Amino acid sequence: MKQLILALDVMDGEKAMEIAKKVAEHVDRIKVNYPLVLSAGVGIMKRLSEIKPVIADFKIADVPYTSSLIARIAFENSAESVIVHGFVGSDTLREVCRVAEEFGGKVYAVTELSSPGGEEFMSAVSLKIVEKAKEAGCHGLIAPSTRIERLREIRKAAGDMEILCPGIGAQKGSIEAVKYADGIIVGRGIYASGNPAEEARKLRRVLKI
Amino acid sequence: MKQLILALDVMDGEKAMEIAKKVAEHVDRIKVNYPLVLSAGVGIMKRLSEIKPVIADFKIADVPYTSSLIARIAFENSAESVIVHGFVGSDTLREVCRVAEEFGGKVYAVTELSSPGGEEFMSAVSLKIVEKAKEAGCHGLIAPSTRIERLREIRKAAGDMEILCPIEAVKYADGIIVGRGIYASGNPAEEARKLRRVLKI
Secondary structure, eight states: OOEEEEEOOOSOHHHHHHHHHHTTTTOSEEEEOHHHHHHHOTTHHHHHHTTSOEEEEEEEOSOHHHHHHHHHHHHHTTOSEEEEEGGGOHHHHHHHHHHHHHTTOEEEEESOOSSGGGGTTTGGGHHHHHHHHHHTTOOEEEOOSSOHHHHHHHHHHHTTOEEEEEOOSSSHHHHHHTTTOSEEEEOHHHHTSSOHHHHHHHHHHHHTO | OOEEEEEOOOSOHHHHHHHHHHHGGGOSEEEEEHHHHHHHOTHHHHHHHTTSOEEEEEEEOSOHHHHHHHHHHHHHTTOSEEEEESTTOHHHHHHHHHHHHHHTOEEEEESSOSSGGGGTTHHHHHHHHHHHHHHTTOOEEEOOSSOHHHHHHHHHHHTTOEEEEOOTTTTTOSEEEEOHHHHSSSOHHHHHHHHHHHHOO
């Protein structure tokens, strides 16, 4: 039951909807971020939620109260889950994860970003984040597919928590990560294609999910 | 002169404008966060900026490309500055401060959150974040007012960077961020005068 999740990082809401409809046979969930949400309005999440379950990747990273409100707004706009940064601490994790459950939704905690800068501070506390997120009652984790040894460590520490991994798609990091991941997140490889439906179909076969 | 900054922490856009009109003349800048911007639309920053300059407290915390897109949208909607997390790495700091240059904007890097959770991971790397933000060419920092010794260390590491904090902190801070305390009173003019006196060192 592994997933292909589309990071629908286009900034035009109508284009976003067009792409979402095109890939419905091959993609399991859609993840949105702030450039789309700020450009199209938070209501774009309600529209997209009528096509696929929507993960609000808002990288929530504030004190508990503000973080709570952001999560609540996401769920009021039909998100099925939100993404929070574990680095900001257990109080925010507990609060956001409880709010999500009050809406019947899920939270994924970021262990470390897939960018080089993620190595500077996040890598060193990634495994501690896993335990804080587990203890805070959170459902899942976001972890890189790029750092395979680290992904293995995270899976070991996570036990059965759901893990989603950003991956370029049609690249070895993504293929290897499949064993440890519950879902692979792909962005521009699909949404910037001349034929997003065909690209999504190809990637499922390449990832063997 | 040290600054007084209004944290406009409501979710209704018309209420936010009503508050800004009443309190405007008494503060230097207005800070908005995502609950307001998501509820009212990012256009609320444009309308507020016509009253006082707006800091977009978006706690920007993504990979460099996406972070830059977020910063760009904030500046496109008239924000004078944005707040970014340094914890996510120097590459994001650089790219966001790179974007700010295009708009003549400022970037404030978060050293550590003022909540208890900030002590779990952020406190350990706070001073290193200052160094990265400084080397990234960022204008300023956000730092807690409730951890005085740490604030002292942050000022030391910051050099002349602008530090904003949400009396003991005043000697280190270039500005203080205050919310409901200013206006929920019967009288923002009087509350502001007291705060200006606190800031007058």
